Amino acid sequence: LGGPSVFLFPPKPKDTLMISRTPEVTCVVVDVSHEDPEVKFNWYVDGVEVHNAKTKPREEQYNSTYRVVSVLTVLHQDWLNGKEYKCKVSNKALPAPIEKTISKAKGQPREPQVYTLPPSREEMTKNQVSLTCLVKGFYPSDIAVEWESNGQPENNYKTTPPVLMSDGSFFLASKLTVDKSRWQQGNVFSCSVMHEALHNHYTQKSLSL
């Protein structure tokens, strides 16, 4: 039952923002039948057909379907310039080919303001405490937030989704949990943030006791 559906995915923010990484867009075709697994992909960048996309190994889903995937590397600045990426999918279980388009959100980019906030007085009685990195006023909502101490990533943090503020920009908060004794020691903790509007896509803010 179908036939197929197409989902077009944008690059990770971290890959578009870091020159040392490789952003790609991912055209995913699901519910491809075993009778007609053959899929034709057409890619375009601002309406112009490209030829450098690569097809991933076909993936048996074991539910009478395959997942068929085409990946297209994007240039960092092209993404960030708002160029349109189109994937067109043809297959014999399809009356018409399916077209899907994605690009960066349209709007005036806004720098995030980044503030680190210490645990509350009230939290000092517990085994672990919370460091908060408030990140507000950003646009668009593509952002990377990580924490570190003494050079090394901290992994024990969770970050809210971006949340839309009334002025159209976004905010979120990242909570880093550390043993109260690591905070007690006076260790320096850093909230690193990557977003297109910062100078060189990066800012870091630190705090300690």
């Binding site: 923002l17 870091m18 060189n200």
Partner: peptide
């Protein structure tokens, strides 16, 4: 200048 994050290059201008 350039930004680095954990010894990996972010961006330069």
């Amino acid at each position: 200048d350039c930004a680095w994050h954990l010894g990996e290059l972010v961006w330069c201008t």
